[PDB]
Design a protein around this ligand. Sequence first.
Ligand SMILES: Cc1occc1C(=O)Nc1ccncc1
Length: 284
Amino acid sequence: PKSMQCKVILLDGSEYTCDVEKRSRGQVLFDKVCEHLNLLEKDYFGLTYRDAENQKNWLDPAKEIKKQVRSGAWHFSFNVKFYPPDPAQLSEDITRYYLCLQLRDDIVSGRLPCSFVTLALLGSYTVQSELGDYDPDECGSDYISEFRFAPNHTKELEDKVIELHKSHRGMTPAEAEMHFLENAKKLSMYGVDLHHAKDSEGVEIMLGVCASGLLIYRDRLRINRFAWPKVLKISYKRNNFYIKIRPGEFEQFESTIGFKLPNHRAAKRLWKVCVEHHTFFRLL
Ligand SMILES: Cc1occc1C(=O)Nc1ccncc1
């Protein structure tokens, strides 16, 4: 029975290697990674891979791995797929830990924009969780943490992390991680998956997919939002993506809204993540 080597980049930046049978469905590999990670609350997570166009795709756990990676390497990342709006609701500390690791990468990468003060507060909770109480012996006036906190590090930011870390004496790792999450969950781009698109007039927009619905960013001046409940049908055709809106009270007709995506694969990818979000966040 022939097996393919799989390499998975974990949220701590380390590499997990395993073998699965070459006709394996994605769930087989995901189950192995989650057992490796001692992760029970698996529903929020998934594996990604890069397609022939170097686009991030979710590995569909119900489909054969080989029919998704196709010509590409069996190389994956372990990621948060569904960001919980209230991480305090999660049953296990280790789930919140992996969600913290993902968010730290969302922040350093710039996918999750954050004010100076919130970057320093999030950083200070990470340092408290990982090193425990502030020790002066480690940090002088010239201290720079090994921890990556932000897309652009400044001495002022490092100083503010230390100032806040000092305030956290006695805080346990789970407690610090829960504070991390209570701050991060409020950020306007928390758990928003962004897709480049054009509206029905050709104006460049971003579509954001998240727990609360589909967001349209025309810029910073005028953001439209469609809460999942309103959305009856999500569809794609050629390079186009459509949502069927519920009729408003006393309106005769449903309303269908249309966007242009970069190519047919980008339209299908946006459709699939919307359908998946739509189901996930109506069902608890
Ligand atoms: C935040 C939210 O609002 C409505 C539903 C949910 C939710 O978390 N659903 C879910 C959790 C775990 N597995 C599957 C679905």
